Design a protein around this ligand. Sequence first.
Ligand code: 25I
Length: 350
Amino acid sequence: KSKLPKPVQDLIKMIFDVESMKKAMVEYEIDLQKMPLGKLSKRQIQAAYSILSEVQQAVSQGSSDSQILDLSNRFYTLIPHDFGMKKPPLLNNADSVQAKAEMLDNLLDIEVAYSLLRGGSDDSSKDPIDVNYEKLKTDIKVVDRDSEEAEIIRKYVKNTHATTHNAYDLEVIDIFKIEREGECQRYKPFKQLHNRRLLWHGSRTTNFAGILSQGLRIAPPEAPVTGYMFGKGIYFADMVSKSANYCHTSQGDPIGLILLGEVALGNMYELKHASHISKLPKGKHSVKGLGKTTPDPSANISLDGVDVPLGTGISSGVNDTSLLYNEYIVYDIAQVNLKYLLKLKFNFKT
Ligand SMILES: O=C(c1cc(Cc2n[nH]c(=O)c3ccccc23)ccc1F)N1CCn2nc(C(F)(F)F)nc2C1
């Protein structure tokens, strides 16, 4: 029987929930019979990314409605969907190709979670929670509610909830100080860089077994760059509600998880509209998407030498931008040092 703190055990319990993995695939209309969770594979997912890129150009340079049919049917061959005996829907536009790329992003992280559960050894004398905790290669400590870290973090959640996202409010349940194995090694070249900020990153619960094990990764080469607004990089935000939206919680699933990572932004290449870039202009370390609203730059405070933009939301003085709030994108996975993990209770007023 495990000796870990109860919050850590409850975190592991849902991080490795097989039923939550099966439900997330059902959410994507995936045929769990022809595509079981045990038969998930990087080779199969990468091929689907590749065919999804085929539909990209044909949609981009306007192909006839029957030329798309073969490429669309091609994608369903690789990723089996459940539509019975009727035709699956056509992937004829750019919105339907990014929705199927978002699924592949989560299928890749779900594959890692199940791969850890089926790999390795089993020992009936050992706690399953203790066994699965060791597979994350991550030291997880419970931050004291009475501590100074918790006060700064609670203020971050309290102050950066956007009015546009007022259909719910956030209640901090647990705060975790996380340390990934070998991550501080990776973060050494950017350890003392300028413009280091503590930013949010939200994701589905079924993604976190892969995030804590392999880190926040960047999409494989086969993924269509057209789907991501600012290209293939790791995206962050300074508003907690913006990142909490990607937890994809609901009334029947009101518990979500969010990250607080140290991102070395450096000299930010600021943009206002989409830019599916591959490389960065020389001298730039990151991309910032300028938003209509920004946290108060005079309310910035420092936590362990890192700047926390927990100021109240105010106007940024930027006209003709496609973003209501800021985005931060880095394109090297070594510029991210994950620091905190929060258990959020979504109280929906909807
Ligand atoms: O970071 C991202 C990413 C996330 C978003 C949405 C998003 N979410 N959350 C937030 O807080 C947030 C904050 C601001 C803006 C946007 C977001 C948009 C494009 C992105 F590139 N990734 C893509 C998925 N993905 N898939 C893998 C792998 F390796 F498994 F294939 N790695 C990744 C990493």
